[PDB]
Amino acid sequence: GDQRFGDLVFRQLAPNVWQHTSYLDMPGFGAVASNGLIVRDGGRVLVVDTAWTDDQTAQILNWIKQEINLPVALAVVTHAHQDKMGGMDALHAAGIATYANALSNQLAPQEGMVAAQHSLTFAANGWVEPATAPNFGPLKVFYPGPGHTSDNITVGIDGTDIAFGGCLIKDSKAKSLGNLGDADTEHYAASARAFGAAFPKASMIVMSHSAPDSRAAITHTARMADKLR
Numbered sequence: 422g423d424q425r426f427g428d429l430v431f432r433q434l435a436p437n438v439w440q441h442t443s444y445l446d447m448p449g450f451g452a453v454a455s456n457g458l459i460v461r462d463g464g465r466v467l468v469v470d471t472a473w474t475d476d477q478t479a480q481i482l483n484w485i486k487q488e489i490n491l492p493v494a495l496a497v498v499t500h501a502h503q504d505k506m507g508g509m510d511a512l513h514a515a516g517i518a519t520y521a522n523a524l525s526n527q528l529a530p531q532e533g534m535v536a537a538q539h540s541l542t543f544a545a546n547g548w549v550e551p552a553t554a555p556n557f558g559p560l561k562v563f564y565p566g567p568g569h570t571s572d573n574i575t576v577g578i579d580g581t582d583i584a585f586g587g588c589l590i591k592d593s594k595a596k597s598l599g600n601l602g603d604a605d606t607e608h609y610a611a612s613a614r615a616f617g618a619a620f621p622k623a624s625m626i627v628m629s630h631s632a633p634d635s636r637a638a639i640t641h642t643a644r645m646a647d648k649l650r
């Protein structure tokens with residue numbers, strides 16, 4: 422099922438959806454996997470999240486060329502940390518239109534990231550303002566509230582059973598909530614639950630650091646976050 426392509430791993434999740442995985446050393450603590458998504462929408466490809474680095478992200482584009490062979494119309498990135506935005510320059514070099522939460526773009530320079538070209542803004546109920554996400558096809562972008570970071574956003578794939586929680590959601594057996602350095606611990610539980618409520622049909626939950634899981638990833642993440650309050 423997993424396809425090794427250089428130093429990256431690709432896994433098909435649905436007829437038009439693949440998960441990309443890349444790795445970065447955290448010195449003294451080992452190699453950390455990060456996952457994003459690749460979606461074919463008719464004659465074009467849409468990407469969710471970069472890899473950790475420009476070189477890895479260019480390799481994602483190379484895999485897309487060889488295994489899908491359609492233009493990448495856009496990429497959306499889900500917060501201003503390296504695992505999700507570290508390859509922005511590679512997307513720009515490839516001519517790909519890039520989108521992030523306005524707050525992610527504001528935070529990008531101080532986080533050592535390059536901002537996306539375009540900023541998403543969100544209604545008070547969390548749904549993206551549609552004019553800021555033109556041509557997103559089946560991608561439905563939702564801001565669930567502050568959690569893993571204040572800017573974290575999430576993405577559902579219409580026409581599939583898949584929703585992507587990024588670094589907000591951990592798997593159903595996870596022992597911790599991971600890196601809380603930029604987290605909002607008071608609001609985390611509610612934000613995890615809001616993600617679940619936004620995508621009630623999503624039975625396959627994709628996330629940044631574990632294989633896809635059932636919706637027990639959402640309940641378990643929220644229950645762990647209850648303890649932070």
Ligand SMILES: Cc1cc(C)c2c(CP(=O)(O)O)cc(=O)[nH]c2c1
Binds near residue numbers: 503505588602
């Ligand atoms: C201090 C720190 C910062 C980050 C961004 C990480 C990440 C990326 P993430 O916070 O987006 O998951 C993974 C990790 O394992 N440790 C970290 C430590």
Ligand SMILES: [Zn+2]
Binds near residue numbers: 500502569570588
């Ligand atoms: Zn993060």
Ligand SMILES: [Zn+2]
Binds near residue numbers: 588
């Ligand atoms: Zn993460």
